[PDB]
């Protein structure tokens, strides 16, 4: 039965995943991120590294 | 008259000390028949593991052959007399009785003398014994209830010498020698140890009598419970079995009758029953239902939910009910001369005394439904269980399941 076994196994993976965004909005929210999203868009001029999300 | 009345019309049990130590017990009767009997204190819990099914063994060939006469002038005598010769063995008590004619009294008290005292253990009767044994245990594997309960037994103490079977393992009975049996005998069947219970047409002092010239030669001189689980598998069996309990107090505990009248309180199931099986210190308190395997389910549930509303909301009718329940099965099974004698006998091998049948019901009539409520709280809500499942046993729900029915979220 799912309900007294991997209720609690995912209730741990939630809170393991929580753990992962918080840490990663907490202490280094622009890890996953690039600096030139936050310069407002110029559509002259194409910034030299254009990548898309990782 | 009335009931208390009635009662009080019930004649005692008189009872003697003889200088070895044996208990003598008796209660007159007007009846012309009556059953003879000696309940030792020894069953399968003080048995270890080399020795598991000692008793049963000696219970098996204690009819066959004392040193006085032959096991065949034995049970010839007893067919004479017309009597019944009869004996059983339960994990903490063993018993041999004789169901005869009053006049027959003397001769059947020697009778037990010769069966107790000097039990002659032929080898070529032991072997016998030991096929026949080999022979019975498989066939009672057949009766699923008895494995149930021999499962939940085991499981329930596991490292306590309660959960042992009385029958015991096939390879301790192929290896137990008659040296063993000697041993046990002469460690167990000894005086102050057994009682000696008559009961029908049998005067006290007679008894006393026959009691002193054939039972005074006898020599003068941590329980656990565990709540685990056992689930045997085998899908051919038509309906599974199912046996649940929870620890129950020992013969000397008050709350014996408030739970006796839970248990009266308490169709999905086939077959449901409720049981209380007591023991010296412990003691299981619970549910055997049989089943169809696609119901199994539904049945723990209903039984558990009883047990919480029970527990939790306990009205006066229904606890009227169960009283009067427990009364009417009191008095009906004392009816008949060997009841009453077993009753005596383990009375006294249990409760000391003979337990009167006034202060049962002065004890019934204390129950309310608020001690109802509590005592069922102390001994079944929010406790770990043992259960014991024969097969089909797929939708039974998994322990954790179980044991969180034990307890609800609303209360």
């Known amino acids: 039965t799912f309900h007294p076994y991997y209720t609690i196994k995912d209730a741990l993976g939630l809170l393991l995943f929580l753990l992962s965004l918080m840490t990663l909005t907490l202490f280094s929210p622009d890890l996953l991120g690039d600096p030139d999203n936050y310069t407002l868009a110029n559509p002259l001029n194409t910034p030299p590294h254009i990548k898309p999300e990782w | 008259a009335t009931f208390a009345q009635a009662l009080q019309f019930v004649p005692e049990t008189q009872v003697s000390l003889l200088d070895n130590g044996l208990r003598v017990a008796s209660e007159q ?69 004789i169901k005869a004619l009053s006049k027959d009294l003397p001769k059947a008290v020697e009778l037990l003398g010769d069966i ?72 167990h069947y000894k005086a102050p140890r057994m009682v000696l219970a008559a009961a029908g047409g049998v005067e006290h002092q007679q008894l006393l009598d026959l009691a002193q010239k054939h039972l005074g030669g006898i020599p003068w001189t941590p329980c656990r419970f565990t709540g685990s689980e056992i689930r045997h598998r085998d899908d051919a069996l038509p309906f599974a079995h199912v046996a649940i309990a929870v620890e129950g107090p020992g013969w000397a505990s008050p709350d014996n009758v408030a739970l006796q009248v839970a248990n009266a309180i308490i169709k999905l199931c086939q077959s449901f029953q409720t049981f209380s099986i007591c023991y010296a210190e412990t003691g299981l ?127």
């Not at chain 2, 020894?42 to 049963?56: I, P, W």
């Not at chain 2, 060939?61 to 010769?85: C, D, I, Q, W, Y």
Request: with cysteine.
């Open chain 2, 116 to 187: 107790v005292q000097n039990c002659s253990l032929e080898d070529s009767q032991i072997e016998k014994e030991r096929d026949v044994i080999l022979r019975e245990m498989q066939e009672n594997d057949a009766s699923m209830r008895d494995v149930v309960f021999n499962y939940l037994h085991a499981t329930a103490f596991q490292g306590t010498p309660l959960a042992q079977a009385v029958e015991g393992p096939s390879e301790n009975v192929r290896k137990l020698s008659r040296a063993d049996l000697t041993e046990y005998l002469s460690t």
């Open chain 2, 285 to 411: 308190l619970g549910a055997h239902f049989v089943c169809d395997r696609m119901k199994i389910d539904d049945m723990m549930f209903v039984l558990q939910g009883q047990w919480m509303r029970l527990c939790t909301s306990a009205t006066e009718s229904e606890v009227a009910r169960g009283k009067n329940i427990l009364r009417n099965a009191l008095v009906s099974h004392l009816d008949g001369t060997t009841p009453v004698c077993e009753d005596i006998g383990r009375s006294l091998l249990t409760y000391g005394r003979r337990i009167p049948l006034a202060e049962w019901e002065s004890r019934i009539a204390e129950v309310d439904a608020s001690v109802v409520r509590e005592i069922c709280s102390k001994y079944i809500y929010d406790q770990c269980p043992a259960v014991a499942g024969y097969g089909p046993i797929e939708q039974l729900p998994d322990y954790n399941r179980i044991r969180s029915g034990m307890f609800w979220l609303r209360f």
């Open chain 2, 29 to 97: 009767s007007s009846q012309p028949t009556c059953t003879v009997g000696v309940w030792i204190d020894v069953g399968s819990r003080f048995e270890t593991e080399k020795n598991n099914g000692a008793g049963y063994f000696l219970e098996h060939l204690a009819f066959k052959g004392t040193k006085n006469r032959p096991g065949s002038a034995l049970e010839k005598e007893v067919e004479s007399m017309g009597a019944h010769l009869n004996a059983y063995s339960t994990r903490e008590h063993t018993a041999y009785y």
